[PDB]
């Protein structure tokens, strides 16, 4: 669903989808080719 995001102080607008890519366990978030946030880790438990 398109909703407002606030993730650990970082904001955004979009949808939440599954992640098929292997990521670092220490990764807070990541960026796309446009250098904006395409992927985020949950702060409470480690989930992407």
């Amino acid at each position: 669903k398109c909703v407002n995001f606030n993730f650990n102080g970082l904001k955004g607008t979009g949808v939440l989808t599954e992640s098929n890519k292997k990521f670092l366990p220490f990764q807070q978030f990541g960026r796309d080719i446009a250098d904006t946030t395409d992927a985020v880790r949950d702060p409470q438990t480690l989930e992407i």
Binding site: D42, T45, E47
Partner: protein
Amino acid sequence: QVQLQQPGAELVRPGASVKLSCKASGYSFTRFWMNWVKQRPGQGLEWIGMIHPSDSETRLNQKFKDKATLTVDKSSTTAYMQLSSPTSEDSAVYYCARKDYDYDAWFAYWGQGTLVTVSAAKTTPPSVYPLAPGSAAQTNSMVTLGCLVKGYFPEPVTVTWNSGSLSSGVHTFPAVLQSDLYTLSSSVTVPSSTWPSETVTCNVAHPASSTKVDKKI
């Protein structure tokens, strides 16, 4: 304690429309999504649809397009499901479930269940007759008694033993459809000290017609 509430049974003819109620309490109504689960016996579970209640936006199955219509009520915190022209294969057991979203979507809570029987028949009050052996060969130390419940519609019917006094040693049997009517029997085994002391009666409560029949054995 969040608990979803549904009515027990609904009766509808084919070609008409039926409406169901799922009542949510203990949690805010616009913070979750509502899922509808169809259970036909022997086939397994089937998935009807999923609706965001705040935006009133629906996600439906491809086979189930135009059969179901999902609407919500934000004031009463109650989700609805409206079916359009059900068939004989559409008689099933309907559930509603709250989906708590953290990573994977599980099914956290469930409703009480609703059995919808689709047919053109009319609601018949039950005819309850007692079943007694009438004699004894004195080969057993316990007494077996029974009741006979026939001529009713729709199923299920509530059959209790002495208004729910005996919770042990009872058997509940399924109904058999014959000529738009249902027939089920039940049995009990009581010891020989109880049977002259207490009188076993047939207490049958029909929830559809609101008729309670008390017949003593």
